[PDB]
Amino acid sequence: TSNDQILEVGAVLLKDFIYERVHRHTVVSRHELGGSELSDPTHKKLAQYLQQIGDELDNNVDLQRMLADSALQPTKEVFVKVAREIFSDGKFNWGRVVALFYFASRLVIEALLTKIPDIIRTIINWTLDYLREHVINWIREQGGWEGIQTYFGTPTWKTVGVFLAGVLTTVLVM
């Protein structure tokens, strides 16, 4: 319910997001990442939600083959090139933010794998800084970390309406 609070909530979600991605994948501790385990129910439930999207993405083999490209490295120029490309058209939506989250979590995993744990807070701050400088007025226009399940759910909600209407056509007209 404020720019500072939206980013502070983003930080706690991003940290917990990367922790669980590494956790169910090499170990990194919440304290290493700069976060505490969520206590807020709203945060905990959105965190549980973000995790299911991460699992859907893990099961995209073509995504995984890209992330395994040797060019995918836990480095400033990789982060900046990718972050900018995610958002470059200005048509923001919650899939853009999640894709940045998921991409960040993989840089952290690669920093673990390549034995440079010391950059992990830096990866985190790259990601928070980009949100702070470019994405936070958008999120505020959503009223906070709100609208997430509206955005991912609407397209399939609509197919229910189209399905029911076809049932009714079949049954009331024919």
Domains assigned to the chain: 3-173 (1.10.437.10)
Any idea how long the chain is?
174
CA distance 174 to 169: 7
Q: Do residues 91 and 54 lie in contact, with contact meaning Cβ atoms separated by under 8 Å?
A: no
Using the 8-state DSSP alphabet, how is residue 36 labeled?
P
Cβ-in-10-Å burial (0-12, 13-18, 19+) of 51 comes to: middle
CA distance 170 to 164: 10
Angle at 44 between CA 38 and CA 46, to 5 degrees: 135
What was the resolution (in A) of this experimentally determined structure? Answer: 2.4
Q: Residue 67: how many CB atoms within 10 A of its CB?
A: 17
Q: Do residues 35 and 16 lie in contact, with contact meaning Cβ atoms separated by under 8 Å?
A: yes
Helices (H) and strands (E) in the chain, counts: 9, 0
Q: Which is it for the CA torsion 92, 96, 98, 100, positive or negative?
A: negative
